[PDB]
């Protein structure tokens, strides 16, 4: 006080000069000053100490072996895994913009025909549609495409395990003039888990727990970084707020209402009225 | 980038200016601004944020219901406990220091007499010794000292449930000259545990997990703010690199080689050569 408490503090940093590994010792070397100026900064009761301790224990015990990293959602809903995936993702060009993975991913999905509907399930029809590009406009011709989303439920297959295997789920390709056609149903917004201390926290900032309704892709192809990134739906009520800060301007797409029959629906003819979203997707050389 | 990043981190932020509690509000905003400018500062990859995520887990796994808390050592090895001890007991005057309690302190121990012996078990006798005196340096009278240490097995009883009931634990009074007097076996220094994650970090780290040894004393009296402290041996090999940086400079106290039948041993009279510590606790009035 104040030499006191910077003295403590300063020895809980020098500590660390010791590490054989420099990069250990800048990390954990940034991460005390972080969490001591924090401290600090808000003058931390010994009560609320607890809390903090309470609450880091709680999530780390709701981490099953299995199907829920409580920790994992706490670094979505403050945004840290947002930031770190854009510090690695850093693109200077007129890329894609590239998102989280999340925790949905599933291999061995099916190989899906151009224009091959992956909806098994109810919803609204929808075909999402457009071109992988490079950065100089060209076609990517043969690009993989893995996509997936959540049913009409809020859930995806099998995080579901009720739901068809491969539904709404597929890899599909894009072709010599670099097109790509999925039919699927419109994504819909799904709240994240909140039976655990992620919910309480979001309680306790008045803070709902919902996605915007979203279309993941990972995108690959020969010569090119890959891209991993999630479409929005344009008009969702959520866009603006989503729980774990998923949403970037760019990664909107509007899926707008086409006749049947329409003649820009990517050389498909469309039997009934639908509903359409576009998108050109860009990619990084390697 | 650096717009996009620095848009994440806002959206992270202000996410929390909804709390209806703005204690809350004000700690998770400085906590999420800490935390991406920790992750911003480091450039923090993928892979360390999964390591980071991995570490968390295991922690708060690591906690049981009962005599292990993962979570509370991380918060002691990385200073933050002292810091918040610090920060919560700020004095400005000649008051004694304070500290953390520690995990160890046990209820209803016996109330013993001046001069009481403690050490039930084996090591090298000593007297502790002084008095409990107010700012002004009158004596506090009827003040309760509550004190523990390890055994020389570096085991608390019965932490060590193996050890007699009571052992090194006493609660002691200051008489009508505010003096009080304790005998017992010089504490000696032993380790924290390092079976868990913590001890993962400290080996990263290149860090030692020894505490220096010392006494730990809770001082209560009417009239007077409670004191939670600790007095560490003058000599002891790890005074200045505590692994949860408790020791500060005027809580060491020497253990002196004195003669037998010594005078000034506070009235009483050893019978043999023996260790012997002194030390004036200051209180401060309510
Ligand atoms: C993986 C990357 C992430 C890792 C980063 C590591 C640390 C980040 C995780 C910390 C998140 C902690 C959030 C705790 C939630 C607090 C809470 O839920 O209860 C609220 C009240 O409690 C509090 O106000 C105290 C909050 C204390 C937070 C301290 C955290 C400090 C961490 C350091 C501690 C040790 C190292 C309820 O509000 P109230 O009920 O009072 O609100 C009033 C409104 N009502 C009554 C209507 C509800
Ligand atoms: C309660 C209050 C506290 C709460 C605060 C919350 C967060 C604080 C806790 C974080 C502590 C993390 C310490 C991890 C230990 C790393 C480790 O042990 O392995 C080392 C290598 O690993 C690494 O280098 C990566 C370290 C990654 C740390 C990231 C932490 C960021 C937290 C945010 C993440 C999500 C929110 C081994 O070194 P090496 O083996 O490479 O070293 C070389 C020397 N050898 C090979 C000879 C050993
Ligand atoms: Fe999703
Ligand atoms: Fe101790």
């Given at each position: 006080y104040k030499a006191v408490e910077a003295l403590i503090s300063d020895q809980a940093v020098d500590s660390f000069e010791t590490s054989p590994n420099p990069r250990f010792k800048q990390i954990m070397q940034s991460l005390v000053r972080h969490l001591h100026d924090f401290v600090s900064e808000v003058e931390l009761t010994e009560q609320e100490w607890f809390e903090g301790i309470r609450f880091l224990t709680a999530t780390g015990q709701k981490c099953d072996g299995k199907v829920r990293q409580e920790f994992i959602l706490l670094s979505d809903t403050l945004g840290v895994s947002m930031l770190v995936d854009a510090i690695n993702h850093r693109q200077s060009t007129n890329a894609t913009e590239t998102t989280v993975f999340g925790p949905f991913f599933i291999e061995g999905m099916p190989d899906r025909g151009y224009?091959?509907?992956?909806?098994?399930t109810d919803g609204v029809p929808a075909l999402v549609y457009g071109r992988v590009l490079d950065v100089q406009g060209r076609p990517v011709v043969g690009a993989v495409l893995d996509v997936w989303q959540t049913a009409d439920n809020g859930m995806y297959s099998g995080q579901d395990?009720?739901?068809?295997?491969?539904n709404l789920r597929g890899r599909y390709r894009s072709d010599n003039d670099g097109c790509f056609a999925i039919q699927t149903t419109v994504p819909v917004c799904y709240p994240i888990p909140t039976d655990g201390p992620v919910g309480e926290m979001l309680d306790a900032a008045n803070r709902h727990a919902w996605r915007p309704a979203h279309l993941h892709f990972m995108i690959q192809a020969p010569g090119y970084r890959k891209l991993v990134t999630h479409l929005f739906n344009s008009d969702d009520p959520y866009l603006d707020s989503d729980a774990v800060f998923?949403?970037?301007?760019?990664?909107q797409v509007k899926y707008e209402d086409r006749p049947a029959h329409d003649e820009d629906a990517g050389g498909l003819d469309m039997p009934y009225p639908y509903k359409s979203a576009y998108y050109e997707f860009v990619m990084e050389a390697e």
């Open positions: 224009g091959e509907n992956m909806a098994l395990p009720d739901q068809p295997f491969g998923g949403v970037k301007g760019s990664l």
